[PDB]
Design a protein around this ligand. Structure first.
Ligand code: AMP
Ligand code: AMP
Ligand code: AMP
Ligand code: AMP
Ligand SMILES: OC[C@H]1O[C@@](CO)(O[C@H]2O[C@H](CO)[C@@H](O)[C@H](O)[C@H]2O)[C@@H](O)[C@@H]1O
Lengths: 422, 421, 413, 421
């Protein structure tokens, strides 16, 4: 009658690291934090980490923000503020400030947790689950908690093989036959390859399980360390590995997926192309990421919208759709929409051709537009007859064009070109 | 009198009569009350009266149910239970029992209010707004409250000209130069015409404003009256008219509409054909009912659904859509959808042709189906290759077929034909 | 396998039988169902079964209602309507119009669509804390088709319960419903092994069992009288000792469970919360009880008409109360209770909105909703006078309602 | 006709809930002033927000001019029940404290200017500017009517204050039409009111603006090299010079039960004033009526056990005189007089508490005596400690005001060697 599998999440608290400032998504995060980035027609990226907590039995969450992110706070307020504190459940907004240890010496990810240590101790959790709020994945944290307790570990790090050519952006580790971490290097310019596979490196997913009291001591010591950068990957994980108290958790043990024969899904959405790719996956016939799984639902802000409306064009002609998502509030006049994802309240006027495009909420596409392989940002007013995705040189002049050929259009770019955004 | 326009809704309580069976809707109301009938891809009919209350400043509502309406109670529970009683706001579920006065003498709508009189008196309301919960319309009751007080009336009846050929279903009235009601007949077989116009009759909309303490007295007397059918239209309104204390409120004074040049919108959704018509109106290019007006929004249960998904069919071909509404959770594989309204989580498989059809939530349409001029009820599993709307006699044998040719399909009908549900 | 303890509640649905009339509660249930009976200064009885479900991981609940259900439905609407169905959680209001099993059978179409693997049947008119997830594990490990939670009870009151006999494997061997001559437990004649009205069912097995019962013209359609004996004869029923799953702070204490059948038991259970060390711990954050969080002003104590202070001894005073001096002893005051000057209130339960006039003395009594006690009235000191004006139980507990006071000529407006 | 009801619907309220300060001493070391506990169960910002709701203004922007953890959490818990589709919300609008010089602070108007993009999209016709750190009841809809009837571009709520305290306020002079003729912000020598030298006509920091006019004014002010970007110091005098500013006497819209009483308004600037305003609610006849159902104050509805009174260790009863005891409290015997105990306050045996304000989660040890003091959140008072009886000893251990009111925090106790966990 052992109940440990059910008791561990109740004794745990999840801490979601929700963003230090960055700019790898370019203008896409100019006016919004990365965890607040739109995804899947109706979600924001942070919804996945939070929904993973709820579905894993962890109903106490702390979302740590490193600056005043308006749209992230509003999203938490409107879609993640339904809890009753008397039932041992909450979503706390924990403000961190970016602190410097020197003129150009930044304090790290661990410092954001250290600043809020007084509030976190009062949670009286036995286990602390540290999460990155800017990744898209489904994982059962209760299974990782079970693995963490079974191994007698003080710190357990979720791990996953990644292509070695992209491993320099990750913490890379080496483990023994017991999944105990033997070596750990943070963002190596020369990433060690996995034994028996030089094409891959064993990478850290930024997902940790901690003994609570051990984490408090470690942060107290780290805060007083004059040599530390106060970063989980750069400072804390190597130190725990050296003490022999750190273990690895292979992601397939806890990744939640409908098709058991498939590869484990995990997207860090680092580049504009990866973001564009991850959204369009949901529009394909067989998406890699299953969002119709009632057994692991993703919670978000339930926006009240009119049903998607399709009307004849100015010539009275019908519209055509091929492998596309049309969110609520959209109004499409004829046109051709193919391999695309349209967020809420998107207006597509007559005689349009939209192919492999991601249109964020409130986008207004004027008459006779052709958009290909692009991302149209919030509330853009595309002027009539505009063509995007057909002339590489012209696209790069007007907007942002990635090396792979993916175009990003914002209100500021269009206004710069003389197209009114009212 | 400075702040009266704002104070009146705060001193008012709305009673929504939601016991309607709507038998003329046939199997559509076999397992649900008429106020719980689906509409507009994402609403139920009762949402309009309740949203009208909220937008009018009347945040205290009593929904009277004349039996055990499970799905009506659940809808109120899901989408209309967000109120905080300490802020002088609530939506109360007030159960009434259907009572008989004789062998086949049914007590009326007023009896349902009388049964709950103890609870209603405790509201301490100064004005009571009586509403029908089975109609679709937008109205600002605060304008009617101002009109009611300025006229010094004890009872104010919202009225609107209707075609005389349909006026026998309504209470018909005649008014003087001051909007005071002079004559009133309830559901006349030969409806009196308006003096200005023999093509129209001045009809009652079943929407009343009452002086609260006057309403209580009237119901107490009516409960003891051995000659009364205990009905608002058949009994109470004629009595108030005879006393000279009843006044009329022209609907255009308070009807909310985007286009001021248009005709006032009001649908009683009495027949299957009218219900089918009112739904498809929203799919047209310029709908008569504007559901995109942010200035008078309609509140409902905000169901969490995946975005509407369109995928290629088995042959890898695209889909076509013409003047149609596709709600969230739907997944459409190719096919042709024209002049149709699809509610939530409707599944349309490959090679389908759907024309002038209303598909209620969770309908599963199999491969190679053709549906025309029909209403498909909740959770129907249409078997592969089924054709509807092309053979009039065949449709009438399998399902219900309206006089004008509109077909209604339910789970029970398909189960009788041997199609597993 | 290793995740079974967590996955069983997610595959379960709880059905709360909340049509209870509570005949032995007299006027206390004249205008309200027994699950809607006030308790603990701020709760309704049904809150415990529902809170037990939430704390057990069972977030899908069906509340079956029937008699005098207005105040019960409103309570569910106010305090138990915060769920988001997309996260596989709800509290359904299932109206029933023949015994307890018939109410479940009537709603069988809706319940099947829950697609539950296990069904937990609960009585919504009892006060207790239980972890149903532990009972679910025991149900699966025993391979049972039906598991019945059991507890030893004094044999002199065992005729009100279903009594059972079990073997060495907790398999139910004999079962009799409400026996006039209750069999005693082996090795203890002072006690009988009683059923708590709490069952765990294999879902598909329960549906079949209800289908057969509906077609049985000889059945009374009752869980205890009809279904449990049938399962016992087939050898498919098992017993679950309540201490396995009973939730309690003090591990040395006796398992807490109250059916509050009589006015005296209801009065007793309320005053227990006012004692120094209550048997029922309502300060345990590890098993909290959810209810309607009513917005109330903080309890206000003011000087009496003579400018004197007030005295309190082992009492609970809910929000919105305003007490003018007076003496309140061993009492429980619900929300918005007004106690005027020069009053003496001892061993009394005052339900919400009670107005106590000046110079009143109330002892060993329960005053019902919104009663307006006139000035100088004395209750609990003259037995015969109490019995003439109000209801007086055999043990001497007095029940006062607004209707009784109105009959005596005391205005209730 | 319907103007009285339409004006709040066309308005948006901006609550200024930021601005660092230290007039409350350690009381605001770890919380913003709008987040300061009050009345046993409220935070100060609840009044402005409740005034908006009760005035018909359901769209609110709370500007937080820095990172106030406990203020955001309170909004998240008690003011996040809105449905945006029904034209209602409480927005958290982040402002940062901006400098114009080495010690030249940009003012309250700058915080509104920073969020001008978000505010314009509200598409409001009128903007109501509110201070989120004051305690008062006011019907903003009455002030909106007065603003429109006077044809004003800006209307300033005003009231007479004692001239010896008027230097902390904006002081104004008005003509016979309540038009503002002279305005000076925080004068060292405040002008007296005509016909009463004991009083000055003061600004309450409550403004009604024509929305587009305010946006123009803020655009110009953001580009003004001479402006401190403050409503009182910069904007109001500028509008006054143009002759477009009007005054609104507070009694026109102040909400109060007793019509014969003086208008209630507290800025709670000092520890003594804060202590005073709390204890007023514990008196026999409080100046501020918190039992008025017609103007309820909304807050975080925290789930708490009923206030529990138990015998002390010697089995003796407890005594209470003119006190408020919030939910979750557990008092063991003891004597509680003229005090206000917030939620979850634990008072052990043999205690004497007089004229004291005990904030949430305070644990008072055995045999303690507290007088004329405010004990902050979660203080663990050690056994036998005495406060409020020795002025010199009190000033050494804690903070002691001029008037003799003592403030105790967890840090002060831990500094004295008394464990706080
Ligand atoms: N309809 C809109 N028009 C212009 N700006 C907007 C609109 N909606 C949001 N924004 C702003 O654009 C940025 C992106 O916000 P969001 O899409 O909510 O993450 C934020 O600064 C928003 O305030
Ligand atoms: N998916 C479904 N399958 C079968 N019956 C259903 C389904 N959804 C609802 N019902 C039943 O249909 C009746 C009315 O449904 P509705 O008003 O659409 O909720 C009720 O008896 C429901 O229990
Ligand atoms: N203040 C009140 N005055 C009179 N009757 C009431 C009051 N509050 C509730 N009731 C009624 O008393 C009965 C039982 O109330 P309750 O305590 O809510 O279960 C129901 O019929 C209620 O409608
Ligand atoms: N129980 C507690 N013990 C210690 N500090 C607390 C406690 N509750 C809140 N605080 C802190 O006290 C400060 C102000 O609290 P409050 O404004 O009451 O939420 C914040 O820094 C809180 O984190
Ligand atoms: O995950 C968010 C963010 O954290 C950083 C460090 O700032 O990297 C962390 O997470 C990585 C996986 O996402 C780990 O591999 C790494 O060890 C850890 O420091 C950023 O690189 C990343 O975007």
């Amino acid at each position: 009658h052992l109940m440990l599998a059910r008791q561990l999440p109740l004794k745990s608290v999840a801490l979601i690291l929700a963003g230090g400032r960055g700019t790898r998504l370019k203008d896409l995060t100019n006016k919004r934090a990365k965890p607040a980035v739109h995804f899947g027609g109706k979600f924001r990226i942070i919804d996945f980490a939070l929904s993973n907590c709820i579905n894993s039995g962890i109903r106490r969450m702390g979302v740590i923000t490193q600056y005043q992110s308006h749209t992230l706070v509003q999203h938490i307020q409107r879609g993640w503020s339904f809890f009753n504190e008397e039932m041992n459940e909450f979503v706390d907004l924990l403000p961190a400030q970016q602190r410097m240890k020197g003129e150009n010496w930044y304090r790290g990810t661990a410092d954001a947790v250290t600043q809020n240590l007084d509030i976190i101790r009062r949670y009286k959790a036995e286990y602390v689950v540290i999460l990155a709020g800017d990744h898209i994945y489904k994982q059962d944290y209760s299974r990782m908690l079970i693995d963490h307790v079974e191994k007698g570990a003080r710190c357990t790090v979720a791990c996953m093989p990644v292509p070695i050519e992209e491993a320099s952006a990750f913490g890379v580790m080496a483990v023994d036959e017991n999944d105990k971490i033997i070596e750990f290097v943070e963002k190596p310019a020369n990433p060690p390859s996995m034994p028996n596979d030089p094409s891959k490196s064993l990478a850290s997913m930024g997902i940790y399980v901690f003994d609570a009291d051990y984490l408090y001591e470690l942060l107290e010591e780290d805060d007083r360390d004059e040599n530390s950068s106060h970063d989980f990957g750069k400072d804390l994980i190597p130190k725990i590995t050296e003490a022999g108290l750190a273990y690895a958790h292979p992601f397939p043990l806890s990744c939640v997926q409908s098709d058991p024969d498939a590869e484990p899904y995990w997207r860090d959405v680092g580049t504009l192309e990866a973001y564009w790719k991850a959204n369009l996956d949901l529009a394909s016939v067989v998406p890699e990421l299953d969002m119709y799984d009632r057994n692991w639902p993703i919670r978000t802000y339930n926006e009240s919208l009119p049903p998607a409306k399709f009307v004849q064009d100015r010539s009275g002609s019908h519209g055509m759709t091929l492998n596309s998502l049309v969110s609520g509030g959209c109004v499409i006049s004829g046109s051709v929409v193919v391999q695309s994802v349209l967020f809420s309240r998107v207006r597509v006027n007559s005689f349009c051709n939209i192919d492999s495009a991601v249109l964020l909420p409130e986008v207004w596409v004027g008459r006779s537009c052709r958009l290909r392989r692009c991302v149209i940002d919030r509330a853009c007013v595309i002027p009539e007859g505009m063509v995007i995705g057909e002339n590489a040189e012209e696209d790069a002049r007007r907007f942002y064009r990635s090396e792979e050929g993916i175009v990003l259009v914002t209100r500021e770019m269009l206004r710069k070109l003389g197209h009114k955004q009212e």
